[PDB]
Amino acid sequence: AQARQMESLNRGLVAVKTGNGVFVSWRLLGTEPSSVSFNVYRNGKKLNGSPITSSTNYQDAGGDLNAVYQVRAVLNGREQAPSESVGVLNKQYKSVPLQKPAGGKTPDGVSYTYSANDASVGDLDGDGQYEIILKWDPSNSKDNSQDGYTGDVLIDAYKLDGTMMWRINLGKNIRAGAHYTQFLVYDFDGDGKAEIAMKTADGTKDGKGKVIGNANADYRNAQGRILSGPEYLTVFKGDTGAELTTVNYEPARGNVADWGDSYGNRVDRFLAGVAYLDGERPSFVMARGYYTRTVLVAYNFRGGKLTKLWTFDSDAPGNGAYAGQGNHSLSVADVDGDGKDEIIYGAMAVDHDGKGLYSTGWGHGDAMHTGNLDPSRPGLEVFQVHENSNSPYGLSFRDAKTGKIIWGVHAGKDVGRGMAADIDPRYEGAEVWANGSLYTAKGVKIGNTLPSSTNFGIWWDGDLQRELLDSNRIDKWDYQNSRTVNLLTASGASANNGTKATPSLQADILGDWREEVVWRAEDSSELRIYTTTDVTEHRMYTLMHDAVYRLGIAWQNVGYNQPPHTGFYLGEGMQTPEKPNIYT
């Protein structure tokens, strides 16, 4: 009973030169009725796609590199104003060149360079096409448990044509590393353009060069950590990067040792997430802590003002079960039916008003997947893994609303990876895997092997199973032979963060409902946006117009990046998915 704000997008038309013709795909928008159809136009407004639809891709045999495409929606037998016009890509990726920052030297005395790291997307200027907001990582970035000085964290915005809109420098008082800066790109106020929200400090320099706080404060200690001095929360304006408003980060660190160590590990474990706590409009949550004291703080940014909505603190009375449950990521989804978003903080959940929903007591894990994994169960499921060898489960498949287990598997050990996806059509729903085994959504062990990666799942070819993504590979589970075969190796491109091996971004940002992959070139001279050329016979509303998925894109960069999920069941046997309840 609720419509959600959702980004006004253009048709997302993309064309790609293939052996034999040109491949084309476009969006089906969530503002459109299911009855819509399309005609495709090659060059001189030539109708080409003679009758109409059932998908939003089309293979054009008589297409060449000099061709120009437009598509026209048909609303009730009446063709509409054409889309934007596009040329043809001579390779299966779009190059976005980067203004790569020059290296530098820390007090350390050491030298360091930058590489393109985690990304997000948003419509910063309102033209109906996504920009890429990119985090730059210095080669001396640090995990929380490693001493050492780190280079400045920088965040750029780029249009798809390579236009660099601005650079923000977080400055010397924001340590570089996976668990420090978590950045949220969303249209919070509803003005139709996106803002950026993240944690700042004395000396962060906005996109117009304006310094926040004291440009001469240096709270870096001799171990390269910032364990003193004030802490800020800032939202910047999308098209310019300018400070809009800055408030005090909550909670502040206080006595560092109260978090469970004196050397600055547990205290600087951060997460963040966009959530429609309204059921209608976006909020965001900034989180601090998970091994230990765990605090979530929710906000709105509307009418130029940042307002605190609520605070959940595990130190607070009655909330002590909720400590030690958080993962190195979070999920966001209406799990209880009320139209409003709850926060699935790893092995615990917070309700939309700031109140504990449940704590499983199974403890912190390094991966999680929240979606409709078993389409035979109404409601969502959460499949995750757990670090605690003394946990009853090393992998657990539970009810997302109550937190009660559905099935789970005792390992007496850390299980540091786990995945969820429909890779086997013999079993309706998503299969899951971790710690040497592959299971049905019901908990039954399939075969004896498992896919060659346990990282990301990506919808890439034309079928309803999901494919696999790791390093610079897209792979496919051959469920008949129990082997992983390769569909694409993006040679020259590279993933990020060594063993995590994640892409800068995975997201349906162009064309068809299939997902695009944003990998950096090895030297970080360009980002590459890969889009599929597999003709599909399936049609769906753009994944960026689904609530759970869009919010998945917004937290992908967060902590140890996890892959996105749809709020509906996407896989073999799915129903023809219905128009989403949204406005633009």
Contacting residues for 320 by C-beta, under 8 A, at least 6 apart = 314
Query: Does 372 count as an annotated binding residue?
Result: yes
Using CB under 5 A, which of the segments 71-79, 203-211, 418-426, 517-525 binds Ca ion? 418-426
Specify the residue, 202 or 456, whose C-beta has the smaller distance to Ca ion.
Answer: 456
483-512 footprint of Ca ion as x/- string (CB under 5 A): -------------------------x--xx
129-168 footprint of Ca ion as x/- string (CB under 5 A): x---------------------------------------
Environment class of 269 (CB within 10 Å of its CB; exposed 0-12, middle 13-18, buried 19+): buried
Query: Does 209 count as an annotated binding residue?
Result: no
Q: Which of 561, 565, 570, 580 binds Ca ion (CB under 5 A)?
A: 561
Q: Give the whole-angstrom CA distance, residue 246 versus residue 444.
A: 51
Per CB under 5 A, 427 contacts Ca ion? yes
Amino acid identity, residue 21?
G
DSSP 236-251: EETTT--EEEEEE-SS
Per CB under 5 A, 189 contacts Ca ion? yes
Q: Which of 7, 60, 125, 243 binds Ca ion (CB under 5 A)?
A: 125
Specify the residue, 225 or 514, whose C-beta has the smaller distance to Ca ion.
Answer: 514
Q: Give the three-state DSSP class for 547.
A: helix
Q: What is the 3-state secondary structure (H, E, C) of 502-543?
A: ECCEEECCCCCCCCEEEEEECCCCEEEEECCCCCCCCCCCCH
Which token pair is 227? 């364990």
**Which residues are registered as beta bridge partners of 359?**
348
Specify the residue, 109 or 303, whose C-beta has the smaller distance to Ca ion.
Answer: 303
Query: Does 261 count as an annotated binding residue?
Result: no
Q: Which of residues 100-119 bind Ca ion (CB under 5 A)?
A: 118
Which token pair is 380? 């969502």
Contacting residues for 356 by C-beta, under 8 A, at least 6 apart = 312, 318, 319, 321, 322, 348, 349, 350
Using CB under 5 A, which of the segments 59-67, 167-175, 258-266, 556-564 binds Ca ion? 556-564
Residue 254 to residues 209, 336, 377, Cα–Cα distance (Å): 30, 35, 44
Query: Does 516 count as an annotated binding residue?
Result: yes
Question: Contact, 579 vs 31, CB < 8 A?
Answer: no
Give the nearest distance from C-beta 43 to Ca ion in angstroms. Answer: 24
Q: Give the whole-angstrom CA distance, residue 238 versus residue 188.
A: 11
Per CB under 5 A, 546 contacts Ca ion? no
# chain residues binding Ca ion, by CB under 5 A: 32
Q: Which of 152, 156, 424, 475 binds Ca ion (CB under 5 A)?
A: 424
Which token pair is 275? 């959530």
Q: Give the whole-angstrom CA distance, residue 545 versus residue 548.
A: 9
Specify the residue, 219 or 560, whose C-beta has the smaller distance to Ca ion.
Answer: 560
Give the nearest distance from C-beta 459 to Ca ion in angstroms. Answer: 6
**Which residues are registered as beta bridge partners of 331?**
344
Amino acid identity, residue 506?
Q
Using CB under 5 A, which of the segments 2-10, 16-24, 209-217, 414-422 binds Ca ion? 414-422
Which token pair is 187? 């249209």
Give the nearest distance from C-beta 474 to Ca ion in angstroms. Answer: 10
Q: Which of 142, 266, 340, 369 binds Ca ion (CB under 5 A)?
A: 340
Instruction: Specify the DSSP element, H or E, that contains 231.
Output: none
Q: Give the whole-angstrom CA distance, residue 426 versus residue 486.
A: 21
Specify the residue, 212 or 432, whose C-beta has the smaller distance to Ca ion.
Answer: 432
Specify the residue, 74 or 160, whose C-beta has the smaller distance to Ca ion.
Answer: 160
**Which residues are registered as beta bridge partners of 517?**
506, 530
Give the nearest distance from C-beta 541 to Ca ion in angstroms. Answer: 12
Query: Does 334 count as an annotated binding residue?
Result: yes
Give the nearest distance from C-beta 9 to Ca ion in angstroms. Answer: 10
Per CB under 5 A, 476 contacts Ca ion? no
Environment class of 418 (CB within 10 Å of its CB; exposed 0-12, middle 13-18, buried 19+): buried
Say how many C-beta atoms besides its own lie within 10 A of residue 461's C-beta: 19
Specify the residue, 374 or 526, whose C-beta has the smaller distance to Ca ion.
Answer: 374
Question: Contact, 96 vs 526, CB < 8 A?
Answer: yes
Q: Which of residues 255-284 bind Ca ion (CB under 5 A)?
A: none
Q: Which of 315, 336, 399, 414 binds Ca ion (CB under 5 A)?
A: 336
Residue 60 to residues 38, 45, 112, 470, Cα–Cα distance (Å): 14, 14, 48, 31
Q: Which of residues 63-102 bind Ca ion (CB under 5 A)?
A: none
Query: Does 118 count as an annotated binding residue?
Result: yes
Per CB under 5 A, 123 contacts Ca ion? yes
Residue 233, phi then psi, degrees to nearest 5: -125, 125
Per CB under 5 A, 60 contacts Ca ion? no
Query: Does 330 count as an annotated binding residue?
Result: no
Query: Does 239 count as an annotated binding residue?
Result: no
Per CB under 5 A, 338 contacts Ca ion? yes
Per CB under 5 A, 243 contacts Ca ion? no
Q: Which of 243, 351, 475, 546 binds Ca ion (CB under 5 A)?
A: 351
Per CB under 5 A, 372 contacts Ca ion? yes
Binding site for Ca ion (CB under 5 A): 118, 123, 125, 127, 129, 178, 187, 189, 191, 193, 334, 336, 338, 340, 351-352, 366, 372, 374, 377, 387, 422, 424, 427, 461, 463, 465, 508, 511-512, 514, 561
